[PDB]
Enzyme design. Structure first.
Site, PDB file in Angstrom:
ATOM      1  N   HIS A   1     -35.795 -22.105 -21.240  1.00 30.53           N
ATOM      2  CA  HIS A   1     -37.074 -22.553 -20.345  1.00 30.53           C
ATOM      3  C   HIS A   1     -36.531 -23.741 -19.445  1.00 30.53           C
ATOM      4  O   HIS A   1     -36.301 -24.615 -20.236  1.00 30.53           O
ATOM      5  CB  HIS A   1     -38.122 -22.652 -21.423  1.00 30.53           C
ATOM      6  CG  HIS A   1     -39.382 -23.245 -20.800  1.00 30.53           C
ATOM      7  ND1 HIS A   1     -40.161 -22.294 -20.047  1.00 30.53           N
ATOM      8  CD2 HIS A   1     -39.999 -24.580 -20.779  1.00 30.53           C
ATOM      9  CE1 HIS A   1     -41.301 -23.179 -19.636  1.00 30.53           C
ATOM     10  NE2 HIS A   1     -41.045 -24.264 -20.122  1.00 30.53           N
TER      11      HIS A   1
ATOM     12  N   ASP B   1     -37.871 -26.252 -16.619  1.00 26.71           N
ATOM     13  CA  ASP B   1     -39.107 -26.912 -16.051  1.00 26.71           C
ATOM     14  C   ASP B   1     -38.650 -27.469 -14.689  1.00 26.71           C
ATOM     15  O   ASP B   1     -37.490 -28.288 -14.692  1.00 26.71           O
ATOM     16  CB  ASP B   1     -39.593 -27.919 -16.900  1.00 26.71           C
ATOM     17  CG  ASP B   1     -40.150 -27.507 -18.307  1.00 26.71           C
ATOM     18  OD1 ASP B   1     -40.946 -26.796 -18.311  1.00 26.71           O
ATOM     19  OD2 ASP B   1     -39.514 -27.793 -19.327  1.00 26.71           O
TER      20      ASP B   1
ATOM     21  N   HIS C   1     -46.316 -26.075 -14.595  1.00 27.55           N
ATOM     22  CA  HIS C   1     -47.171 -26.555 -15.720  1.00 27.55           C
ATOM     23  C   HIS C   1     -46.735 -27.851 -16.250  1.00 27.55           C
ATOM     24  O   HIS C   1     -47.585 -28.638 -16.901  1.00 27.55           O
ATOM     25  CB  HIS C   1     -46.980 -25.593 -16.887  1.00 27.55           C
ATOM     26  CG  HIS C   1     -45.662 -25.324 -17.484  1.00 27.55           C
ATOM     27  ND1 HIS C   1     -44.787 -24.300 -17.086  1.00 27.55           N
ATOM     28  CD2 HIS C   1     -44.902 -25.995 -18.315  1.00 27.55           C
ATOM     29  CE1 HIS C   1     -43.901 -24.447 -17.607  1.00 27.55           C
ATOM     30  NE2 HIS C   1     -43.558 -25.461 -18.493  1.00 27.55           N
TER      31      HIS C   1
END
Ligand code: HN3
Ligand code: NAG
Ligand code: ZN
Length: 1016
Positions: A61, A63, A442
């Protein structure tokens, strides 16, 4: 033909509003699965003829900004992850890896040498590296506008098709804080077949797990037939990390994260470390792991099991790739060779998992439930509801919507022509799309990044806005100059944009004054653009150096105008009052612009020595005890003064609005005869708890219901004009303004929370409307969803995203509040609406950000307030989960999100100027929009291609006769059409070759994309 989106309630197995009404939400200790139960399985379920197929899916993941900026993370982490992924996948043909964030991947791939590019293409082509979703980012689903969700999806997927020759059909959204049905809507119209989500309320996971409803066909709330349905997999546990993905017991699963043995500075908080798999322990380790898998498998309907293997910025070190791969290979070899397990386990990709699931489905092994609704508001544990981020960093939330519109306008204005490479049009538009796309992350629009990261997103968006301005102003000059005169310097500024509402009065003094004078320059051309596909009138204003200015169109017809002062509000640290000062050196001129569909209109401002015939002057009244004079340079009317008192105003035939002596709305009278309907604005404040969990960037944890802001005796300014009137009041932390132009008022709040730590400022509306426990909020500016206030849930759980609007209604009356920015809001009692303005929080809320929110800055929030009678409207039944705007409310929303653009000619004389562009464009029905117009080819393409995204909303039928409008056929907007195709929304696949090169209009609530091809 078209589905009825109003009158037919869909029949679905799970309807999330209905589910919410029935569920108890008890937070009981479920054992090792803290939020579930002790899962049991029949060991004999799996046998030689029916094995459990297990896909372990490695992931990382990444970001695009959070604790570090995009570029910081790229240099420190992501470039090493992608480099080592390339090496390790190349060297280990059975290893697999999925990748989501195309912003990072593009950044990496363009820095690769050709040898490595070819290696990369090969591991994608052979299925080892698989892209999931393929958007520029993994966007927020609460605050993001659907148009920007599509923009960023298209940016990433267009890159993937061009460079990697793939288009993902499976989506992976493991981190957004709650989930929206806008995603399956867009994805299903963009060729997708499957999607995966993770962050849903722990009580929802438990409820759906118990019914094996974690895999479902997710359709839209209004969709009776089911054509919008997209297969969706909801992960069952608290996190996407390894401890929460192998099975229900994180104490066991943590032992199978081989990065946690010590040398990587990671450990297992459940106090049992992983141990290297060996021949001596593999049987025991396999027994533990397989037991976890079989427990997880109990929650789903097929014999195919998804086991994600990853975490934040994983698969960085070479040693990490080895330690995960070698240990899992040993487990697979043992498990797969021991018949008694009846398991076949392997590394897999997400598409591989979904393909196998649907094979099982087609074999008649399972049938899946249908579901509609959303997954807000998320709580990950106890009463920790993530409604804070609906408001956090509201300056940048508002900037999002401004840039949204500037990108649309820049792409549309420049689409009409093909441009030489030297004009740098494509370059500037790509930069703008990419920075806005990045912000959909996000941790971007959500306001959940560190202070310096917020600054990076802001700087990127500022550059994107400047790129849009450049493109827009070059385009206007080309569209409105006689072709044989047109003579561009592609670096020159022919026009400057004038924007009344961004950054806004009292936020930045950014606007240019039009300087006129008998001894310098008698007149100035201005141009308005209308991005909407219908004729539109809207008042526009400009700053001018004289009050004696009049307006003409380019046929020299006079245009009625109004001049008002320029007022700015000041905290007078000497008198300790907040009061307005009037400019003595500049003035506002206001007039109604009328602009063709997707077109341009030119006006002229001309100075005179005295009051012009067609220009009026507003009166001004300052209501305060202890007044002092307010001189206004040359302005012709003297300011009047008075003690505070109630006032009433009416512009044109519009509503009559009454205000309290504190300058706040008290009532609205729709017509001459009608009642003065009580509608009261109030500002209140929420605090933070003194013990236990503290509110932060993510969490809203109020210390009880809000308390009224103490207003004292505020200064109130009333400006009364023929075209525009307003009431403005300087309240603590907010200059609150109600503007009247003859329809629904516009509200503007200049919000400066200052140094008020641990305070959230809310704007509330109090009415009589008998709404009970029902209200409506929108999802991504796309659809309105019915909410029911639940007193069984804490206050913060009843907060929802207000990305663009909210309403309450009873049998007879509706109040709709439209926004120009996403904020959090609710209806906490019958007849109320409320929406948070800003929040300043001193503490961290334990979700990894490691700071509060103490970087607030002044922001201008904008709204429209629409009170309407709805007793005559054809509304959905009481059981329908959707609601729909009226025409007036929809137009009011469009006025906030896509206003006219204003351009001031920069030089003294514009040689070859024309009066209008687009007079011949069709003026489409009011519920239809051309959400996107984008030229898809550069100038050297023999066949030019232009893409259109067409969206039709659904407006309530309330007895207003529809006027005959024109059919809009986007394929004939540009001449010499040779082909018209219906495509996926990303424009990447042709779906239909269209008869007669005519693009049909779409059904209510539908969105279609078309590409026209032009031979000249
Ligand atoms: C102690 C602790 C507990 C939970 C978390 C998260 O859920 C972090 C999640 C959700 C919020 C989001 O801002 C971040 C970043 O996007 C990271 O990807 C992990 N996300 C972190 C620390
Ligand atoms: C890309 O993939 C398609 C479909 O698998 C294949 O036919 C083609 O050869 C590849 N390359 C292209 C279209 O350049
Ligand atoms: Zn994240």
């Amino acid at each position: 033909q078209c589905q009825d989106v109003v009158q037919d309630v869909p029949n679905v197995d799970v309807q999330m509003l209905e589910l919410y009404d029935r569920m108890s939400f008890k937070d009981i200790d479920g054992g090792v699965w803290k939020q579930g139960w002790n899962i049991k399985y029949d060991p004999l379920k799996y046998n030689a003829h029916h094995k459990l197929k297990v896909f372990v899916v490695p992931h990382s993941h990444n970001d695009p900004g959070w604790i570090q900026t995009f570029e910081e993370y790229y240099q420190h982490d992501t470039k090493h992850i992608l480099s080592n992924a390339l090496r390790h996948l190349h060297d280990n043909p059975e290893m697999k890896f999925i990748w989501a964030e195309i912003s990072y991947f593009a950044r990496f791939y363009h820095d690769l040498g050709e040898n490595k590019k070819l290696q990369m293409k090969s591991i994608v082509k052979n299925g080892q590296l698989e892209f999931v979703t393929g958007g520029w980012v993994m966007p927020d689903e609460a605050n993001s506008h659907w148009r920007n969700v599509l923009l960023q999806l298209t940016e990433g997927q267009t890159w993937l098709k061009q460079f990697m020759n793939v288009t993902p059909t499976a989506s992976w959204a493991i981190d957004p804080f709650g989930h929206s049905p806008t995603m399956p809507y867009i994805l299903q119209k963009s060729g997708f077949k499957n999607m995966l989500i993770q962050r849903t309320h722990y009580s929802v996971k438990k409820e759906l797990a118990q019914q094996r409803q974690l895999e479902f066909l997710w359709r839209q709330i209004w969709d009776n037939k089911g054509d919008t349905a997209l297969f969706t997999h909801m992960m069952p546990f608290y996190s996407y990390d390894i401890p929460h993905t192998c099975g229900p017991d994180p104490k066991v699963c943590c032992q199978f994260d081989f990065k946690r043995m010590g040398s990587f500075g990671l450990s297992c908080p459940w106090k049992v470390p992983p141990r290297t798999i060996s021949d001596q322990n593999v049987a025991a380790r396999s027994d533990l792991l397989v037991d976890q898998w079989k427990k997880k498998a109990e929650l789903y309907r097929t014999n195919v099991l998804l086991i994600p293997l990853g975490d934040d910025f994983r698969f960085k070190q070479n040693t990490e790739w080895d330690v995960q791969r070698v240990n899992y290979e040993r487990l697979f070899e043992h498990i797969n060779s021991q018949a008694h397990f009846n398991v076949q386990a392997q590394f897999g990709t997400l598409q591989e998992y979904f393909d196998a699931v649907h094979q099982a489905e087609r074999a008649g092994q399972a049938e899946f439930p249908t579901l509609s609704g959303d997954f807000f508001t998320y709580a990950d544990r106890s009463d920790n509801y993530w409604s804070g981020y609906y408001t956090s960093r509201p300056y940048h939330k508002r900037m999002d919507r401004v840039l949204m519109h500037y990108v649309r306008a820049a792409e549309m204005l420049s689409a009409w022509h093909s441009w030489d490479g030297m004009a740098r049009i494509e370059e500037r538009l790509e930069q703008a799309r990419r920075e806005l796309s990045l912000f959909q992350h996000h941790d971007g629009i959500t306001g959940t990044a560190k202070t310096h990261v917020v600054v990076d997103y802001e700087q990127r968006m500022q550059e994107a806005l400047k790129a849009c301005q450049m493109v827009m102003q070059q385009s206007v000059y080309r569209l409105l100059t006689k072709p044989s005169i047109y003579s561009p310097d592609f670096s020159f500024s022919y026009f400057t944009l004038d924007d009344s509402r961004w950054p806004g009065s009292g936020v930045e003094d950014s606007r240019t004054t039009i300087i006129l004078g008998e001894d310098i320059l008698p007149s100035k051309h201005v141009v308005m653009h209308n991005t909407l596909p219908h004729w539109r009138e809207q008042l526009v204003d400009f700053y001018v150096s004289s009050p004696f200015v009049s307006v003409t169109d380019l046929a020299n017809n006079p245009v009625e105008a109004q001049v008002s002062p320029v007022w700015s509000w000041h905290h007078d640290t000497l008198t300790k009052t907040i009061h307005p000062q009037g400019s003595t050196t500049k003035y506002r001129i206001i007039f109604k612009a009328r602009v063709p569909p997707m077109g341009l209109a030119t006006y002229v401002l001309t100075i005179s020595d005295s009051k012009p015939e067609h220009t009026s002057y507003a009166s001004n009244l300052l209501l305060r005890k202890n007044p002092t004079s307010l001189p206004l340079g040359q302005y012709p009317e003297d300011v009047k003064f008075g003690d505070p008192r109630e006032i009433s105003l009416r512009v044109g035939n519009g509503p009559t609005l009454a205000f309290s002596e504190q300058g706040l709305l008290k009532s609205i009278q729709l017509t001459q005869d009608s009642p003065h309907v009580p509608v009261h604005f109030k500002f209140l404040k929420y605090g933070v708890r003194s013990h236990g969990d503290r509110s932060g960037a993510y969490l809203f944890l109020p210390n009880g219901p809000a308390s009224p802001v103490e207003l004292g005796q505020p200064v109130v300014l009333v400006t009364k004009g023929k075209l525009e009137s307003s009431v403005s009041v300087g309240l603590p932390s907010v200059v609150h303004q109600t503007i009247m132009r003859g329809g629904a008022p516009e509200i503007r709040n200049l919000v400066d929370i200052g140094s008020l730590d641990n305070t959230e400022i809310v704007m509330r509306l109090e009415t009589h409307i008998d709404s009970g426990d029902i209200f409506y909020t929108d999802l991504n500016g796309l659809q309105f969803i019915k909410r029911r206030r639940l007193d069984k849930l804490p206050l913060q759980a009843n907060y929802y995203p207000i990305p663009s609007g909210m309403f309450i209604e009873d049998a007879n009356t509706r109040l709709t509040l439209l926004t120009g920015q996403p904020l959090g809001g609710s209806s906490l009692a019958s007849g109320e609406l409320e929406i948070m303005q800003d929040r300043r929080l001193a503490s961290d809320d334990e979700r990894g950000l490691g700071q509060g929110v103490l970087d607030n800055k002044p922001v201008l929030h904008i709204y429209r307030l629409v009170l309407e009678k709805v007793n005559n409207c054809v509304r959905p039944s009481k059981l329908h989960p959707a609601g729909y705007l009226t025409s007036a409310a929809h137009k009011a929303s469009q006025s906030l999100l896509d206003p006219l653009d204003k351009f001031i000619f920069a030089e003294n004389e514009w040689i070859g100027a024309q009066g209008q562009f687009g007079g011949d464009h069709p003026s489409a029905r009011e519920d239809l929009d051309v959400s996107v117009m984008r030229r898809l080819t550069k100038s050297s393409a023999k066949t030019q291609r232009v893409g259109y995204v067409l969206h039709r909303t659904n407006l309530m039928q309330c007895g207003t006769p529809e006027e005959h409008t024109q059919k809009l056929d986007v394929c004939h907007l540009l001449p010499n059409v040779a082909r018209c195709e219906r495509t996926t929304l990303t424009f990447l696949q042709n779906l239909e070759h269209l008869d007669g090169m005519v693009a049909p209009e779409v059904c209510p609530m539908e969105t279609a994309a078309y590409v026209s091809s032009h031979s000249s």
